[PDB]
Amino acid sequence: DNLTELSQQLKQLTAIAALAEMGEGGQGILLDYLAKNVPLEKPVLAVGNVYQTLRNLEQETITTQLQRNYPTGIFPLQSAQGIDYLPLQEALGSQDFETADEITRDKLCELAGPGASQRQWLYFTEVEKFPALDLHTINALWWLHSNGNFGFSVQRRLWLASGKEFTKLWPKIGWKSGNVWTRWPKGFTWDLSAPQGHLPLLNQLRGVRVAESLYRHPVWSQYGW
């Protein structure tokens, strides 16, 4: 039957979208898919898309069931430093990308330690020493909850495709428009209409050293990003 065919299609995005618009039957199939695939080991975009598509329906019973079954979301919230990533997950699950961006900024300082937490900005050497595990968790959350549109991994791949020229990267990801830097916070696009790689933001006020160290970090290759 048609719904079963759609289940097999889990192109993944098209089936998921169709199933979600097909009432209780379609939504049941999506819920069963999560039950069979969560918690994720590796990030799988289809699973992120099923969860987020269901969240986006904004229906009490679905949302309540998701919170009950998956109170911490679909991806293990692991940290080499014991950091709490649930508020980041919650902001992303609500598609509140502006809050998610603020939390990510705060969490990176927390990850770097007392000094960064106090000054509220990073040195490139702190970024180089970040544990891979935390960067993987943070990136996975952004990626899984944005249909792969957001994440440092996404920016890194665009940077690689720009010959590592940051001046070519900024317009691609919407951080500069010609000679004009995008102005924080109102100039940015806090939704999925934003260009690929738009979030999370890396303030350029202190130069590109932090961003470059982040994109060169071993985590991306290590975890297959």
Ligand SMILES: CC1=Cc2cc3[nH]c(cc4nc(cc5[nH]c(cc1n2)cc5C)C(C)=C4CCC(=O)O)c(CCC(=O)O)c3C
């Ligand atoms: C080239 C350039 C200069 C510049 C000048 C500033 N940006 C700021 C703040 C910020 N700019 C941001 C993002 C970006 N700025 C970009 C380019 C530039 N911004 C590009 C992006 C994605 C973000 C996220 C903040 C808030 C966090 C923070 O204060 O560090 C602030 C206020 C910072 C402060 O008062 O501490 C200034 C002066």
